[PDB]
Structures are given as C-alpha cells and as structure tokens.
Design a protein around this ligand. Structure first.
Ligand SMILES: N[C@@H](CCC(=O)N[C@@H](CS)C(=O)NCC(=O)O)C(=O)O
Ligand SMILES: N[C@@H](CCC(=O)N[C@@H](CS)C(=O)NCC(=O)O)C(=O)O
Lengths: 213, 213
C-alpha cells in the first residue's frame, strides 16, 4: 500500500495527493500531528531526518520530499491514469524536466515566503511581514512575466499538455490566491486562465477541499 | 551532437560538464560571455527566457536549468557510461530522487548565497557581506548535520553507490572549500571524507581545472 504521512491542509502533502489522484491510485493518508510536534519526534525523523511532511512508505521503501514522491509515483505507474511525465514522447518528457526545475528553483523560492508570511507566521506568533511579502511578490511577478509569455505560446508550461510541471504549482498557488497577492496571477491574462484551468481539474478539486478552513 | 552553452568557470555549467564526463559523452562547449551580458541578449533569451546559463541543444531540442539538463542526459544515456540514476534498481532510483530534491530545496538555497558573496560580490564592486555569509553558514550547517548522520550509515547520500544526488553537490561545494566557510565541511568527518571522495572522481577533476584561475 502507498502510505502517505502528512496532513490534507498542507501544501506539501497536497502536492502528492493531487498526483496520486491524477494517477487514479489507491493510497492511505496517515495523519501527522504537526500541532503536537509529531514530525519532530524520533519515529517520524526516521522517515524524514529533516522533520517535515510528507513522507511515503511503500513496503520496505521510504521516501521524503514531495516532488521526489510525485516523480517516483509518476514514473512507476506509467501508462495508468494521466500521462504526467510523458512516457512515450522523449521531446515532451524533456520539456517537463525543464519546467519542473523552473518550479523548484524559480517559482517556489518566490511564492513560498509569501504564503509562509500570510499562513504560517501567525501560527508562530508573528504578524505577516509586509516587507518579505512585497519583496517576493515582486520576485514572483518577474517569474510570472516569463510564464505569461510561455503560456501565450503553449496551453501549459511544458507544452500543449498538462504535466507534472504544472501540477507542482497547484498547492502554494492555491493559498496565494486566497491572499491580496492573488493580484500577480489575476493581472496576467494567460497566467490567470492557466491557473483557472489546472485548479479546476477533478484531481485537484478533491484535494482543494482539504486545504480549505 | 550535444551542444552545451555556458562557461567552464561557472557552477551551473560545471554541474552539467561533470555529468557529461560521468556518462562518457562527447559534446561541444559553446562559450557564453556573461561579462559582456550575452546571456541577456535576444539570441540567448531564445534558448532560455530567464537569461541564465547553461542551456543545452541536441538537434531540434533545447533545454535549460542545469539539473534538467543533467537529468535529461542521465536518462537518455542511462544504459551506458556510469549509472547515475540506477536504471536497474527502482528502489535505489527512488532514493536518488529523494536526495536530488534535498540538494535543490535544502542544500543549494543555503550554500549558493555563501558562494555568491565570496565570488560574485567583488564583481559587483562590493565586499563580501559577512552577515549573509554567517546566516547561511548556520543554515548550511544544519543541513550538513543531517548529511553527517546519513553518511555514517551509507557511503553516499542515496546509498552505498555514487549517484546524481551526490554529483549535483560538486560545483558550489568546490567553491565553498576555497573560502573560510570550508569549515562546515571539514568539521564533519563523514561529510569531509564524502567530499574528498566525490571531488576526486576523474569525471570531476577534469572539470575542477576549469573552475580554477
Ligand atoms: N522541500 C520539502 C518541504 C517540506 C515542507 O515544507 N513541509 C511543511 C509542510 S508544507 C512542514 O512540514 N512544516 C512543519 C514544520 O516545519 O514545522 C518538500 O517539498 O517536501
Ligand atoms: N537554476 C538555474 C540557475 C542558473 C544560474 O544561476 N546561472 C548563473 C551561472 S552559475 C548565471 O547565469 N549568472 C549570470 C547572471 O545571473 O547574470 C540552473 O540550475 O541552471
């Protein structure tokens, strides 16, 4: 059984959950109690020594890092459910690799701090830092300027097909759109339409429920 | 023929060069003049709209992001040269994915600003910012504390085999070891031996020469 350790409301778990649904896979979501600090105790640290969710146990295999887990799932269950990494087109598969790396090294480092300040900082007892928000909204805008041009050429980031590249953007963007920083998406027409597209896929709509209130 | 656009002395290009050598592949290195701002002009922007090196062309295929390029090479030529991704052991393969994601999301964000301050800031006309250095040295230390424990259990990050996960660490770490921040590697005995191991591989020694003045 694919056993996913995490929480429905977290961006990092949701990234895997939507991938699991795209692939039409059975799985078990095992709750990890972040409130009680379960992720920092010896049992979970043995799954992920960095003490963050999610982790995956599949028989004797144990994985962590959300995008390692999605990549594993996408590769292992080739030909089942949606074709996320393009297993029968080399050119397409390569482009997916490009834009998943763009998400990791360009999109995520800019959007993560925005969501952290709005959603996580209050949990740590701090008001959102407007300076950190504004700086990264500027940075994300510049990434999104490139996205706007790309998405004017192709339906999705890696080409005229939905892929793992787009998928990885769903969770942090979902929370961004709940904040005033939603403006960076809404003011770029191709990015906005792209977001409205991928965020309305059945495989994410089921996951979106768990990310709400 | 594989055409790599970049510069020997750059970490991002060096990351691809070492992979090419591990895979025993022939290639053409096409210089891009950063000092002259070539990477910011339309011809190169047509290759990478983000205007940074490296980029790869193979026939009509064009790629950017260093780790997308290494992944593409390691996959396409998986059956020949060194087994970077473990193409015959799906569990080892999964482990490599975990630790390449660790390099992208945990190691690189901590080590990059350190190297930037030491080696790029003077090209900006500034002295190295010791505050940014110290803060990220603290961060990198926490990451390496985890590595230290993992490398007590297996010879390399993903297991007892060298892999793409280890490889991706080579370039920034190489420049780190030329600075006072080399201490974070040298003070952790398993991390130190692991570094001295992977950095002595013939596929990297060829590359390290181009990273020296
Ligand atoms: N790079 C990691 C990031 C993991 C991460 O940020 N997890 C968050 C949830 S979204 C977490 O565990 N927060 C609890 C904490 O750090 O105390 C991944 O993609 O899996
Ligand atoms: N995430 C990118 C980073 C690319 C990058 O940082 N390139 C540097 C060379 S190491 C560059 O082009 N610097 C020139 C500039 O920023 O003006 C990758 O891994 O390829």
């Amino acid at each position: 059984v694919l056993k996913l350790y995490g929480a429905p409301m977290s961006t990092c778990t949701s990234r895997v959950l939507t991938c699991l649904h795209e692939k039409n896979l059975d799985f078990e979501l095992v709750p990890v109690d972040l409130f009680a600090g379960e992720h920092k105790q010896p049992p979970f640290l043995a799954k992920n020594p960095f003490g963050q969710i999610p982790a995956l146990e599949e028989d004797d295999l144990t994985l962590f890092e959300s995008r390692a887990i999605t990549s594993y799932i996408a590769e292992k269950f080739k030909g089942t459910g949606y074709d996320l990494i393009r297993h029968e087109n080399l050119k397409e598969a390569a482009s997916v690799k490009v834009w998943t790396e763009v998400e990791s090294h360009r999109y995520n480092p800019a959007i993560a701090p925005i969501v952290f300040q709005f959603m996580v900082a209050p949990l740590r007892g701090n008001s959102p830092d407007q300076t950190i928000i504004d700086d990264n909204v500027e940075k994300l805008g510049k990434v999104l300027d490139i996205y706007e041009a790309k998405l004017s050429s192709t339906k999705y980031l890696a080409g005229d097909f939905y892929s793992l590249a787009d998928l990885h953007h769903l969770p942090y963007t979902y929370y961004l759109m709940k904040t005033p920083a939603a403006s960076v998406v809404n003011e770029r027409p191709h990015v906005k339409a792209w977001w409205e597209d991928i965020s309305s896929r059945p495989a994410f709509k089921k996951v979106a429920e768990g990310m709400n209130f």
